[PDB]
């Protein structure tokens, strides 16, 4: 079965970007859409949009890359150099507002899920709350 | 191993094994000489290594190296063992402390005297 929907999505994204896909579909879920909202706002993805594949709901994720490069291998630098799942089924990970990590010395983010909604580490710290540590992106 | 597995069986902590049953895990042990033989080296090395069977107060009967240019150990001489093997002599796990009990220090030792237990020579 599909054991971890959230992890499935981060991977679909990690996988598509590595081959430079423009778009990329992932089965829609309220929660997954909540995450994508941050991904866009934090500028990691051009954005995303609801779509119907074979009749079922999906979320097109519009990938973003750096510009073309010089020398051999003109492949663009990724905008999403990283994106790793943390809390996972059978090893849930929650943090207090004092334990919210500082990803990549601030240049990267961390998406938490708080009783105040899905926020980034900075947002969470502001609202002074903690919660399940969904993932880490940079 | 899966996290759930780690939870079930968990990691096993490593157990170091002593290399010197000078028993009592003591720093030194005193014994009595039995045989002041002279073994031969291993693999490449060659020479007449001076050794000594010792009956420890720890109940163990062991073989010990006798460092130094020349010794004075005999059949029933009391000695002190300090632990430390000798790469060439299979079976020798401790050195004999020179300058203690019956083992006299090395004569004419003008350098690393701290070892070879020899007093400070009075410069004429």
């Amino acid at each position: 079965m599909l054991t971890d929907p959230i992890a499935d999505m981060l991977t679909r994204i990690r996988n598509a970007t590595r081959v430079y896909k423009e778009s990329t579909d992932v089965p829609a879920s309220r929660f997954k859409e909540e995450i994508l909202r941050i991904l866009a706002r934090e500028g990691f993805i051009k954005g995303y949009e609801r779509v119907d594949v074979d009749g079922k709901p999906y979320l097109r994720v519009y990938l973003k890359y750096g510009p073309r490069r010089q020398g051999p291998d003109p492949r663009p630098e990724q905008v999403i150099h990283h994106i790793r799942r943390i809390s996972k089924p059978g090893r849930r990970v929650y943090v207090g507002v004092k334990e919210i990590p500082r990803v990549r010395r601030g240049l990267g983010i961390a998406i938490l899920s708080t009783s105040k909604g899905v926020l980034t580490d900075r947002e969470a710290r502001k609202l002074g709350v903690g919660g399940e540590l969904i993932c880490e992106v940079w | 191993p899966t996290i759930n597995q780690l939870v079930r069986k968990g990691r096993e902590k490593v157990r170091k094994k002593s290399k010197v049953p000078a028993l009592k895990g003591a720093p030194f042990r005193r014994g009595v000489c039995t045989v002041v033989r002279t073994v031969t080296p291993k693999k490449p090395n060659s020479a007449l290594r001076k050794v000594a069977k010792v009956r420890l107060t720890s109940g163990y009967e062991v073989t010990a190296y006798i460092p130094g240019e020349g010794h004075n150990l005999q059949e029933h001489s009391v000695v002190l063992i300090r632990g430390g093997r000798v790469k060439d002599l299979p079976g020798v796990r401790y050195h004999i402390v020179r300058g203690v009990y019956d083992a006299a220090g090395v004569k004419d030792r003008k350098k690393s005297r701290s070892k070879y237990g020899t007093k400070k020579p009075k410069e004429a």
Partner: protein, 104 residues
């Protein structure tokens, strides 16, 4: 506060006493995942009220017998052997894994 617990009556085989199986959860001190252990308490049932399958609230009390420091505070939800089953089925595997072996 006299400690209050909730569990299931997995045994009604004694007089004025019942065996409540209180479940518990928590994060493993080193590997963090939420593990789930469980313990059986012998609770005092004077009226012989509570029956096998009942979910009850246990309350810290004054000793009643040796190995018995809890009284059935109240009933939370009646009948539901789906739980007693787990407990019994687990006791059943014990009926082996020794010199023979537990079914399946």
């Amino acid at each position: 506060p006299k400690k209050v617990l909730t569990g299931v009556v997995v045994s009604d085989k004694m007089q004025k006493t019942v065996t409540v199986l209180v479940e518990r959860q928590f994060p493993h001190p080193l590997y963090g995942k939420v593990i789930k252990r469980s313990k059986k308490y012998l609770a005092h049932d004077p009226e012989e009220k509570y029956k096998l399958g009942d979910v009850v609230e246990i309350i810290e009390s004054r000793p009643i017998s040796k190995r018995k420091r809890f009284r059935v505070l109240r009933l939370v939800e009646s009948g539901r052997m789906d739980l007693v089953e787990k407990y019994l089925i687990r006791r059943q595997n014990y009926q082996s894994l020794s010199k023979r072996g537990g079914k399946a």
